[PDB]
Amino acid sequence: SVLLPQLRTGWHVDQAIVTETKRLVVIRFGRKNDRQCMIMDELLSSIAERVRNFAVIYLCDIDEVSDFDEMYELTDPMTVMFFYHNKHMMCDFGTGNNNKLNFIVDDKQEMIDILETIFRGARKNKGLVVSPYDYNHKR
RNA sequence: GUUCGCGAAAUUUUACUUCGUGGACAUUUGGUCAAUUUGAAACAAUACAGAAUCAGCAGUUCCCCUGCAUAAGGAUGAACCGUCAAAGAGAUUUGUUUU
Length: 139
Hints:
CATH topology: Glutaredoxin
Main location: nucleus
Number of helices: 4
Function: Essential role in pre-mRNA splicing. Also essential for entry into mitosis (G2/M progression) as well as for chromosome segregation during mitosis.
Largest sheet: 5 strands, mixed
Strand order of the largest sheet: 1-3-2-4-5
Number of domains: 1
Subcellular location: Nucleus
Oligomer: part of a larger assembly
Strand content: 15-25%
Family: Belongs to the DIM1 family.
Keywords: Acetylation, mRNA processing, mRNA splicing, Nucleus
Structural class: alpha/beta
CATH class: Alpha Beta
Radius of gyration: 14 Å
């Protein structure tokens, strides 16, 4: 958890998205007290060093910044989201919501494969990517 | 209350109509192509998932064979033997077989 930096204003979020051209921007929207928010914080905290080349991971709190709540429709304790060149990325996970992310991923390798596949499909301008894993038993 | 099935009646055995009877009798979600159009905001155009394959040499790493170099190291053969050159001056001797 301490490994990943946190974004304390909406402008740190926005500039974090704008100033980074060549690698994905991954934000976890959620609060420190939640049960599901710390788990993806640990999972993403282990993965950050492997992936630092082709992606970077940041942290955002909903109570700290409530500005994006209505715009991206943030519900559930946590939503992970993926941004490439200011463009919100999108991938059909089988969860029925191709936007953002909700559930807690299990294995490191499955999440690194999601990051890798979203990245690779993102370099081609492709809006929708198809994950190798449809988890929809979860949602 | 809806259908399927069996028994009874009114008529031409199956058929309609009604009685006695055995089941079956929920709705949704997980279902978005991406890319592009100077405006009070709609899915209307514009694409439309088409969103290179055989062969050759060389080069790094080790091994062997054969050359040439270099550093060291060895083995053996080779018939004949070492304390000047020129010019000038002085001193001593010099009848017949092989010319």
